[PDB]
Design a protein around this ligand. Structure first.
Ligand SMILES: CCCCCCCC/C=C\CCCCCCCC(=O)OC[C@H](COP(=O)(O)OCC[N+](C)(C)C)OC(=O)CCCCCCC/C=C\CCCCCCCC
Ligand SMILES: CCCCCCCC/C=C\CCCCCCCC(=O)OC[C@H](COP(=O)(O)OCC[N+](C)(C)C)OC(=O)CCCCCCC/C=C\CCCCCCCC
Ligand SMILES: CCCCCCCC/C=C\CCCCCCCC(=O)OC[C@H](COP(=O)(O)OCC[N+](C)(C)C)OC(=O)CCCCCCC/C=C\CCCCCCCC
Ligand SMILES: CCCCCCCCCCCCCCCCCC(=O)OC[C@H](COP(=O)(O)OC[C@H](N)C(=O)O)OC(=O)CCCCCCCCCCCCCCCCC
Ligand SMILES: CCCCCCCCCCCCCCCCCCOC[C@@H](O)COP(=O)(O)OCC[N+](C)(C)C
Ligand SMILES: CCCCCCCCCCCCCCCCCCOC[C@@H](O)COP(=O)(O)OCC[N+](C)(C)C
Ligand SMILES: CCCCCCCCCCCCCCCCCCOC[C@@H](O)COP(=O)(O)OCC[N+](C)(C)C
Ligand SMILES: CCCCCCCCCCCCCCCCCCOC[C@@H](O)COP(=O)(O)OCC[N+](C)(C)C
Ligand SMILES: CCCCCCCCCCCCCCCCCCOC[C@@H](O)COP(=O)(O)OCC[N+](C)(C)C
Ligand SMILES: *[C@@H]1O[C@H](CO)[C@@H](O[C@@H]2O[C@H](CO)[C@@H](O)[C@H](O)[C@H]2NC(C)=O)[C@H](O)[C@H]1NC(C)=O
Ligand SMILES: *[C@@H]1O[C@H](CO)[C@@H](O)[C@H](O)[C@H]1NC(C)=O
Ligand SMILES: *[C@@H]1O[C@H](CO)[C@@H](O)[C@H](O)[C@H]1NC(C)=O
Ligand SMILES: *[C@@H]1O[C@H](CO)[C@@H](O)[C@H](O)[C@H]1NC(C)=O
Ligand SMILES: *[C@@H]1O[C@H](CO)[C@@H](O)[C@H](O)[C@H]1NC(C)=O
Lengths: 173, 119, 1273
């Protein structure tokens, strides 16, 4: 169905990056009409500035140097009931570092009842030269190797001891 | 529906005549849709005159031929739509019809009473 | 002797009176052979011509002293009457009484009354009788008055001993006649017809041998006394638990937040009548009569945005589904015990209270619906077994001649009969190729094939008829049956659709050579043979129930119709006419009564429908169970006695087999002859070391632990795995480690055991296959082949790692060993069932191929009428016109034989069958729009299939399962097959518990006051007062209800406190008196423990309700109140014995439950891998799906009882648009498409239900062995 996965907080310079904004309706069978607005605040600055708005299968961009001609749409397509609002940056630069706000403005349609909702998701992204490897992968591989070696050494020692014992028994007999 | 009315009612001059009309309907009588239609005709092939109706509440048309002697003596919720005629006079003789409509019951009810007034 | 025949004269009466006078002045059992309503013994020979139908003396010496006389008819049936004058007017010698006796004792009397009763029963089936029925009703009344007057005149009225009124069945006739006359003179019409239906019960007293069946059915009930008491007790305890847990939960609704005009919930709730206005404030799913249920926990149902969960309004299902009062809670628990639509209640309760309460349903199902049904069923089995044992114990105590002989020679067993068998098989396979989208060429070839087969069968028919004499030919029943089949074949050749399917009955001709098909034929024959009376009684009961229901509730369904149907038309199931009333009764007998009961209670009131439905269920289920048991054991033991040899006359098939053994072997040997004419201690120590390591206990424990870890690692791969990056990486690397470890284990086993020993073991082969698949997957992932389609379909086979746990646990190993031992016998009964079901599948395909298509309005899912769009072409005009139009067809239907098999499986299990039957009865033709109940009497097909392919099929299956497990037990010495050796020792240790001799009496204390306490507490009066106090406490807990005032809450709280102070006090008195001997008895230990839990739980619940906010925890600890009522089993000895039987049966049930849980785990992993992204429709929704491990286990536990498996299967059967979307984008995942794989889904669900059925049968038989062992020891 729909799963709200968090966006990755690390983007490498010069390559492409996609910022995930997934907001799933609490009941899937309901019908709604959603549009989104994205806001960006750079490091060294304390004000959040709007950079794009998406509504009715057309993307509107604000006139900002840091995001002009580098961002496209990676969200839900072909519908007004958008549950994926993620965008895509083509050439990540050092001024794209900062924290983002994804404003989702969903208008539910019930029987004689319209509910206007709003959710916000915050994404902080780091721009570095080289993709830092996750601690999880490194530590997990290290424990895999140490466990394999420990099990092998334990097993080998046990076979050595048992072979010595049975050899002594054979000489005794 | 089953409508329980007396075929012929004999009432003395000057006495009070209760006109019994009850119906057996499965569905509860909801006052916002229930319909009751009381008419009066001199003969079977004669004209019917509206004198009482329940559309949301008891509406008394106050016919001149009845003066203010027509009153409601039933309760719709208990399947009773009877009416009473105070101080019966000789010209009250005729045929009284009680038409019942109780949604969502499809059929239409009709009870016919021949009121004969003796000396 | 035979010479003892003399007319009853006045001299004999004088002698009898003189003997009576002598006996009075002075101031034993009779011959059962001479007992009333019996045949006269053959020792008396024939009767003198002047002796028959005349008053003659008493043969029995017992009544020779009293004043009686016997009369004999022409069938040697004695009747015992009274010599005292009938009402002091008519004497035995009077001609009037002579004529009355003559009429009473005759065949034309009984036949006339039988015909009258049958005609009257036929006339009761009419719901709106015309005006020419009243004279017929007067005629029926007169005929009954005639027989009543004759019996009164002949036998006397009441004064005597063998009189009219003494016969208990004559009271029914008196009641009928008085009701008829009195109600006729006085003038509810429906009541007068509920009094007229009693005439249908006179069939029992006029058809011979039915009173015996009725008496046996009464006897079978009396043995069920204690099991019924235990069932009531368990249902009440579970109802109290459910009342405590779920009081008011089914009244949660999603109420909107923003209300205009300064409105509030309380103000709105008083001005709402219609669902059209309820829908504007509460949230309804489209097409739902009830509001959507919600909960306040995170594991319950979730409201849409803009709605908040609130407890207000009525309960679901017209308000009849609830746990609000003890009455409705008991109804719900009875529903759960009978498993009637229990999955709906299970789903509603999980939605309203949370998924964590599935434990309650697991415990309730396994304890009630399994064990209590087992108890009732086994007790009925004992009763009928004792009845049968007593029965058998007492019962034992020129040119024409030339060419006809030539034709007779042409008839030759080895080939001609084998050729006919081959032709029958070919013919049935040929008629199994029919399908709906069939070209004209295929239809033509099928027609010519069916013509040629009929021609050759008729050639056989005529050739045999001219070979043997026609009188000789029609001697054999098989020849007669073949003749009927052939003549109907010619009849249909000269000419319906059902007549084409009477040719499939020739398949039963293979029963001559197939032994287990002959068993089914014998069961079916016994149903109308040795057990014809019981089947006739069942039919009579069904007819009476149908007509009673039609009379009572028929007019209510019509007048009160708008309450149960929005269109104000009669629903699919009703009792307006006889056919639909009978359909309701048959559906109830199948096991579905709650849904029709809701409509009945809506139209006609709760009490009447409740009484009628409970009585129908009780009586019908009892009679069906007795019929099943009689059939089962008759065909099991009585029919098979090996009286004759295996095919005593050498079977033609066996003669052909012998000829083939001669011929093929001889030809091959001659061909061989023609061909011949034409032409190192160190390695042994290493092996010992590996043996030492592998066989040690630590290695076994390590491997078991790693198997558990690897199996549990599969439960984490749900649709949320991309929110858990860290655990996903850890699981990948752990999987690598597991593969390494199992490679090492395989190598160690190879070196220790050797290739021969390793590969002769099946468990080792299973481990080898699993580890090989894992190694191939790892090497493919390493070499970059991680996204290939075959590799991606291989990576779903990791769901089979839990199969490594089978060889590690002894319980699963012994259960699997028993199952594999059972397999071979199951296979043959499976083949017979497939043949029987193939016959019905071909019939259903012939009846319904391509007729389930309809033109529907998609947005609301309603079939268009037949006045507009009655054809496919009109449907296409409207599709290309109105957008939301579709000419779709049912997913499960009779288009071909395989889909017919699926439909038959749905019908036999009664899951999803109703849609099929509606489509079948609405069917018109191919490419024709269905009309409402156009083919109404197609319900007969489903009724007949249910009977034959469910009742008899399951009878055969269990009949073979009984012998299989009996021979399994015999070969190993009678030990239990489901238990391990240690479990056997503990089983013996538990057996000695329930058989201890009376222990040493507790010694009294020397003190005076302590001695008084001893003589007090040890009295039985103390114990019975304790039982009545516990019963009063039970009533106090039953008084509690939803919405009760605070005054009632305080009163009940103080009463419970008083009970606690009484019970705790009684514990202190017993402790003071019995001193340390109080703890020497386990029951007093339980009492002390439960009084401690009661005090502690009451204090803790008060603390939480006063100084904390946790309603869930409050209810969970307030459940400790139940323990006080569990002490009632101490006084009830019978229910204690059944509980002891359950305790003895627990270990084997534990082993089978471990096996079932492992299978469920494997299927859960497979379902998570496959059906995680299938469209959420039918049984798949936001809470009951295959997205997570918890949801998968929720869904699999539900269909373990087969409940709702069709609703789960239906969304998977979507494979192509517009049913599904192959390019559906799911946010947060890379999986594309919401379609299902129909073949995988079908195999999944069918295999799971079959395996669950087998495992449930295993648990059944385990409980039966324990039950019979306990009661007969
Ligand atoms: C052979 C012989 C076989 C046995 C035959 C007799 C079997 C049972 C007959 C029981 C008689 C029923 C008495 C009920 C009388 C009655 O009038 O009932 C009223 C009460 C209270 O109605 P209420 O206004 O609170 O409902 C709420 C209103 N609403 C739902 C419309 C919103 O109904 C309630 O409490 C519901 C009572 C439910 C009782 C469960 C039935 C017993 C279970 C099975 C026994 C085994 C078979
Ligand atoms: C007593 C206890 C009862 C036991 C219960 C068992 C449940 C019944 C089990 C099976 C039900 C499902 C059967 C399959 C459903 C039918 C599928 C279907 O729609 O059928 C259509 C296909 C024909 O293929 P096509 O024309 O689409 O190919 C396209 C070729 N192009 C493109 C070149 C033209 O035919 C097929 O596959 C169908 C052929 C297979 C059907 C065999 C009959 C069932 C066998 C017995 C089951 C026993 C299990 C134990
Ligand atoms: C929601 C409901 C919440 C409320 C429930 C709270 C109360 C429940 C739990 C407390 C259970 C206490 C166990 C009682 C067994 C006491 C005992 O000592 O057990 C003895 C019996 C049979 O021994 P006996 O009576 O012949 O004499 C034995 C004399 N002695 C022991 C001196 C050698 O053992 C046996 O059968 C074992 C019987 C096992 C009983 C399991 C009960 C499950 C319910
Ligand atoms: O039966 C004889 C043996 C059984 O096993 P054992 O440990 O040799 O003897 C145990 C026995 N109690 C004893 O001491 O008397 O078993 C035998 O003696 C039976 C004949 C075995 C013949 C095949 C042996 C194959 C050994 C392994 C082959 C190479 C495997 C390579 C694996 C991959 C590389 C490591
Ligand atoms: C054999 C008997 C039948 C199978 C029993 C299997 C064991 C019992 C399996 O129980 C599974 C349920 O607990 C899943 O529902 P829960 O509400 O517990 O899930 C909570 C999830 N959140 C909300 C915390 C995320
Ligand atoms: C991979 O690990 C293998 C070990 O768990 C094997 O342990 P053992 O079964 O060898 O434990 C000691 C058993 N012996 C050697 C004393 C028999
Ligand atoms: C609810 C859970 C059900 C629990 C029921 C358990 C009742 C507990 C079983 O009760 C029977 C005891 O008498 C067993 O006594 P023993 O331990 O002497 O049995 C023989 C042991 N050996 C000698 C073979 C090892
Ligand atoms: C399907 C689910 C079925 C659940 C059944 C629960 C009740 C049964 C739960 O176990 C009840 C115990 O009395 C016996 O447990 P065991 O079989 O593990 O112990 C037997 C004796 N040894 C092995 C310890 C020596
Ligand atoms: C013995 C068996 C023990 C395990 C029993 C089953 C446990 C089953 C535990 O399931 C855990 C989750 O997969 C359940 O997720 P939900 O469907 O509740 O959705 C969660 C949504 N959020 C919170 C992530 C947004
Ligand atoms: C299917 O049913 C329709 C019902 O209306 C049949 O009606 C035909 O309608 C067209 C156009 O409205 C007329 O020209 C035809 O004359 C109608 N048929 C007849 C028999 O009058 C339609 O014929 C049916 N189609 C088939 C193949 O039976
Ligand atoms: C993105 O644009 C910058 C600006 O010229 C360029 O240096 C960089 O190579 C581009 N990266 C890609 C992947 O096109
Ligand atoms: C990024 O933003 C900074 C703002 O300080 C600007 O100086 C720089 O030129 C920008 N770089 C690109 C590639 O747009
Ligand atoms: C409350 O309802 C009343 C209706 O009688 C209305 O007059 C009043 O303004 C409402 N108050 C608010 C705060 O909406
Ligand atoms: C039916 O469908 C179209 C509408 O899409 C309609 O205009 C036309 O008459 C029909 N077309 C075909 C191919 O039948």
């Amino acid at each position: 169905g729909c799963v709200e996965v968090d966006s990755e907080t690390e983007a490498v310079y010069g390559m492409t990056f996609k910022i995930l904004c997934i907001s799933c309706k609490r009941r899937s069978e309901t019908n709604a009409e959603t549009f989104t607005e994205w806001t960006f605040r750079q490091k060294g600055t304390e004000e959040f500035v709007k950079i794009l708005r998406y509504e009715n299968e057309v993307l509107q961009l604000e006139e900002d140097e840091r995001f002009e001609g580098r961002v496209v749409w990676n969200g839900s397509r072909g519908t007004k009931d958008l549950q994926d609002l993620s965008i895509f940056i083509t050439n990540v630069t050092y001024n794209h570092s900062g924290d983002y706000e994804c404003h989702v403005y969903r208008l539910l349609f019930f029987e004689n009842y319209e509910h206007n909702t709003s959710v916000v998701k915050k994404i902080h992204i780091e721009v570095v030269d080289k993709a830092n490897r996750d601690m999880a992968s490194i530590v997990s591989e290290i424990m895999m190797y140490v466990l394999i070696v420990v099990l092998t050494i334990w097993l080998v020692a046990e076979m050595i001891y048992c072979y010595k014992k049975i050899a002594a028994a054979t000489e005794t007999a | 529906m089953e409508v329980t009315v007396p075929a012929t009612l004999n009432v003395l001059n000057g006495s009070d005549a209760r006109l019994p009309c009850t119906f057996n309907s499965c569905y509860t009588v909801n006052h916002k849709q229930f319909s009751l239609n009381w008419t009066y005709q001199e003969c079977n092939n004669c004209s019917e005159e509206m004198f009482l109706q329940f559309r949301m509440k008891i509406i008394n048309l106050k016919l001149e031929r009845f003066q203010d002697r027509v009153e409601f003596s039933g309760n719709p919720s208990k399947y009773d739509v009877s009416v009473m005629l105070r101080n019966v006079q000789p010209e009250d003789e005729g045929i009284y019809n009680c038409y019942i409509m109780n949604p969502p019951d499809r059929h239409r009810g009709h009870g016919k009473i021949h009121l004969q007034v003796l000396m | 002797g035979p010479q003892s025949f003399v007319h009853f004269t006045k001299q004999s009466l004088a002698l009898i009176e003189q003997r009576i006078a002598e006996r009075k002045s002075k101031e034993p059992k009779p011959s059962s052979d001479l007992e009333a309503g019996k045949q006269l013994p053959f020792i008396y020979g024939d009767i003198p011509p002047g002796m028959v139908s005349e008053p003659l003396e008493d043969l029995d010496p017992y009544y020779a002293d009293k004043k009686t006389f016997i009369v004999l008819n022409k069938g040697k049936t004695i009747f015992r009457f009274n010599a005292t004058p009938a009402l002091y007017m008519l004497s035995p010698f009077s001609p009037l009484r002579r004529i009355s006796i003559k009429i009473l004792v005759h065949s034309l009397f009984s036949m006339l009354i039988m015909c009258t009763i049958l005609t009257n029963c036929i006339f009761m089936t009419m719901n709106n009788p015309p005006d020419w029925t009243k004279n017929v009703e007067y005629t029926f009344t007169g005929i009954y008055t005639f027989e009543s007057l004759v019996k009164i005149l002949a036998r006397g009225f009441c004064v005597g001993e063998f009189t009219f009124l003494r016969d208990p069945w004559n009271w029914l006739d008196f009641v009928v006649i008085v009701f008829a006359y009195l109600t006729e003179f006085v003038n509810n019409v429906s009541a007068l017809r509920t009094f007229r239906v009693l005439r249908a019960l006179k069939t029992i007293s006029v058809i011979p041998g039915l009173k015996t069946i009725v008496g046996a059915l009464i006897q079978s009930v009396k043995k069920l006394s204690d099991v019924m008491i235990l069932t009531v007790f368990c249902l009440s305890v579970f109802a109290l638990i459910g009342l405590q847990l779920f009081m008011g939960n089914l009244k949660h609704k999603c109420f909107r937040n923003s209300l205009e005009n300064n409105e509030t919930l309380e103000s709105i709730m008083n001005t709402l009548e219609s669902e059209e206005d309820f829908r504007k404030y509460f949230y309804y799913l489209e097409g739902s009569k009830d509001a959507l249920l919600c909960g306040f926990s995170t594991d319950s149902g979730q409201c849409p945005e803009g709605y908040t969960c609130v407890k207000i309004g009525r309960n679901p299902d017209y308000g009849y589904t609830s746990f609000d009062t003890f009455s409705w809670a008991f109804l719900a628990l009875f529903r759960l015990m009978t498993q009637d639509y229990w999955e709906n209640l299970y789903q509603q309760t999980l939605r309203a209270a949370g998924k964590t309460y599935m434990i309650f349903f697991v415990v309730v199902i396994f304890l009630g619906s399994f064990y209590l049904i087992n108890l009732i069923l086994a007790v009925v089995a004992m009763a009928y077994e004792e009845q049968n044992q007593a029965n058998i114990e007492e019962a034992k105590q020129p040119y024409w001649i030339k060419f006809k002989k030539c034709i007779y020679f042409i008839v030759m067993d080895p080939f001609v009969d084998l050729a006919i068998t081959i032709c029958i098989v070919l013919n049935t396979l040929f008629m199994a190729m029919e399908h709906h989208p069939m070209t004209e060429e295929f239809k033509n070839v099928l027609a010519i094939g069916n013509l040629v087969f009929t021609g050759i069968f008729a050639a056989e028919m005529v050739l045999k008829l001219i070979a043997m004499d026609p009188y000789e030919y029609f001697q054999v029943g098989w020849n007669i049956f073949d003749s009927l089949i052939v003549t109907l074949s010619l009849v249909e050749l000269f000419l319906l659709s059902v007549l084409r399917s009477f040719r499939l009955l020739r398949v039963f001709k293979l029963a001559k050579s197939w032994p287990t098909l002959n068993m089914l034929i014998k069961i079916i024959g016994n149903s109308v043979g040795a057990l014809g009376n019981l089947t006739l009684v069942l039919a009579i009961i069904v007819f009476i129930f149908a007509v009673v229901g039609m009379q009572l509730f028929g007019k209510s369904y019509k007048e009160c119709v708008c309450k149960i149907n929005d269109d104000c038309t009669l629903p699919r199931w009703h009792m307006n006419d006889f056919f639909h009333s009978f359909l309701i009764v048959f559906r109830v007998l199948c096991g579905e009564w709650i849904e029709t009961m809701w409509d009945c209670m809506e139209v006609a009131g709760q009490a009447m429908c409740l009484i009628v439905y409970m009585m129908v269920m009780v009586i019908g289920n009892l009679v069906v169970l007795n019929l099943f048991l009689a059939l089962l054991l008759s065909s099991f033991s009585s029919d098979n006695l090996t009286a004759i040899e295996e095919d005593p006359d050498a079977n033609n098939l066996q003669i052909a087999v012998t000829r083939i053994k001669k011929g093929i072997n001889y030809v091959k040997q001659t061909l061989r002859e023609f061909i011949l004419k034409a032409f190192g201690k160190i390695w042994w120590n290493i092996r010992k070391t590996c043996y030492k390591i592998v066989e040690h206990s630590w290695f076994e424990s390590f491997i078991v632990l790693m198997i558990l870890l690897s199996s549990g690692a599969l439960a984490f791969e749900d649709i949320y795995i991309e929110r858990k990056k860290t655990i996903k990486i850890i699981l990948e690397y752990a999987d690598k480690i597991f593969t390494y470890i199992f490679i090492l284990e395989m190598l160690l086993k190879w070196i220790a055991y050797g290739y021969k020993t390793y590969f002769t073991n099946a468990w080792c082969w299973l481990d080898f296959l699993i580890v090989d698949v894992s190694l191939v997957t790892l090497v493919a992932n390493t070499l970059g082949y991680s996204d290939l389609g075959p590799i991606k379909s291989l990576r779903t086979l990791r769901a089979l790692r839990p199969l490594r746990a089978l060889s590690r646990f002894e319980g699963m190993r012994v259960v699997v060993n028993a199952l594999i031992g059972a397999i071979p016998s199951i296979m043959n009964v499976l083949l017979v069932c497939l043949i029987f079901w193939l016959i019905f599948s071909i019939m259903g395909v012939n009846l319904f191929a391509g007729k389930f298509y309809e033109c529907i309005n998609t947005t609301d899912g309603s079939r268009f009428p037949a006045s507009q769009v009655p054809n496919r072409s009109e449907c296409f005009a409207l599709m290309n016109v109105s957008q939301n139009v579709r000419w779709k067809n049912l997913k499960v239907n009779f288009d071909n034989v395989g889909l017919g098999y699926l439909s038959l499986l749905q019908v036999a299990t009664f899951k999803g069958w109703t849609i099929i039957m509606y489509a079948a009865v609405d069917s018109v033709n191919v490419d024709k729009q269905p009309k409402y109940e156009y083919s109404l009497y197609m319900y007969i097909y489903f009724v007949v299939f249910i009977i034959f392919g469910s009742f008899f099929t399951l009878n055969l299956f269990i009949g073979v399962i009984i012998d299989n497990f009996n021979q399994q037990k015999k070969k190993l010495g009678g030990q239990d097959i489901f238990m391990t050796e240690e479990q056997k020792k503990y089983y013996n240790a538990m057996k000695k518990l329930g058989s201890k001799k009376p222990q040493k009496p507790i010694p009294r204390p020397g003190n005076k006051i302590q001695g008084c306490i001893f003589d007090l507490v040890t009295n039985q009066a103390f114990d019975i007062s304790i039982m009545v106090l516990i019963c009063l406490n039970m009533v106090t807990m039953m008084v509690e209800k939803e919405g009760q005032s605070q005054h009632m809450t305080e009163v009940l709280y103080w009463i419970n406190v008083v009970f606690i102070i009484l019970f705790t006090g009684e514990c202190v008195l017993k402790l003071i008196s019995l001193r340390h001997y109080y703890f020497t008895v386990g029951w007093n230990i339980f009492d002390f423990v439960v009084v401690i839990i009661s005090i502690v739980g009451m204090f803790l619940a008060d603390l939480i309700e006063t100084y904390f906010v946790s309603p869930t925890l409050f209810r969970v600890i307030r459940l400790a109140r139940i323990g006080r009522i569990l002490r009632l089993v101490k006084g009830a000895k019978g229910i204690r014995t059944l509980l002891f039987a359950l305790m003895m049966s627990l270990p084997a049930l534990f082993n089978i439950g471990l096996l079932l849980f492992l299978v469920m785990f494997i299927y859960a992993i497979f379902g998570m891998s496959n059906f995680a992204y299938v469209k959420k429709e039918d049984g798949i929704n936001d809470m009951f799906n295959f997205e997570t491990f918890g949801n998968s286990m929720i869904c699999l536990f539900q269909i373990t009882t087969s409940a709702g498996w069709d609703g789960l299967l239906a969304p998977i059967l979507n494979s192509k648009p517009p049913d599904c979307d192959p390019k559906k984008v799911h946010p947060g995942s890379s999986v594309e498409g919401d379609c299902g794989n129909p073949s995988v889904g079908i195999f999944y669900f069918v295999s799971y239900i079959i395996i669950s059925f087998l495992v449930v049968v295993n648990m059944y038989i385990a409980v039966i062995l324990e039950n019979f062992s306990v009661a007969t020891e």
